[PDB]
Ligand binder design. Sequence first.
Ligand SMILES: [Mn+2]
Length: 376
Amino acid sequence: AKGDVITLNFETFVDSDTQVKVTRLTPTDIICHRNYFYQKCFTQDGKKLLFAGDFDGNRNYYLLNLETQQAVQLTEGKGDNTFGGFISTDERAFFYVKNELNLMKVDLETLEEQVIYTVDEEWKGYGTWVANSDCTKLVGIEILKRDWQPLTSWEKFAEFYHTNPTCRLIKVDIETGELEVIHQDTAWLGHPIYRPFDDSTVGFCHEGPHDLVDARMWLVNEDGSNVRKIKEHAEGESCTHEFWIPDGSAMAYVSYFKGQTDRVIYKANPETLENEEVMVMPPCSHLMSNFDGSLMVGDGCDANIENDPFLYVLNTKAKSAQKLCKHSTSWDVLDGDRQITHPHPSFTPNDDGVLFTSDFEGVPAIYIADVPESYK
Ligand SMILES: [Mn+2]
């Protein structure tokens, strides 16, 4: 029940291949996972952590006190989207979506909840809400209910893309609760993201197969004008995994050229709109950077070869990737949920560690791998 407290045991072990220290935060007998890597889950001091677990028979949100090893239940009941959740800039509250209908704001102190927005009967919420740096406005996208189709299989994926569904990129005001359509279109839109310290810019993209798609690297101003593509897109080049670097210095992404058998990370200037290569990309699924983009972490995955179960800590400046420790996750889909099993590596607020999920000990749990100065 909302408000309850649970005392956890932190067990630290040494990785057999890198000697790097790794500590498990959650029990090995109950399902737990971290939120999406681009969403804030750590307080600046690095003492509080937001995460999800089934302690109360339901996938709910908890706030873990790293120095007390005690976690308090933030939300109760069923219907929580345990991935999109995030902590406010003032760290006095976190936001999450319940029943895919109501955007909630929760006081981390009183645990009081406030529904700040409720999707209209005409639309369907899609993607994850992303707050602006000041945490006064939220951006997101929605799909016209009539145009909505359940994406069951890949056959249904491409199918939906061609149905050219009408989607809109909206902006909601935390204070007023009023929505403002900043961009609409009869195309499948997605992944809306406010430019870190610049409410002016809002990056979004076109969903669908990376092949039969014009381009996904899109940008548009808050007012709704200057809709443009981040990169010109070279014939044969596919871009993905885009994400704003925390400080807002640039839009980092990964591109792959057919016939080059090599993936390379790229940084795009939000203002100059000029892209530039940064370094190679080891075989990884997700990619997240440091605050300034000087460090990056990656998810080793599957390509007589061999599946890569390692986490990578890339050094932007030195342009060098290095194996940190091992996550050894079974990318299995639990109860239709394909994301709980994803490591979703993210740096700790001061870069001394990397938080990630894994089910190698049997069930999905949360770990924090230390990150030595040599970036081992
Ligand atoms: Mn993922």
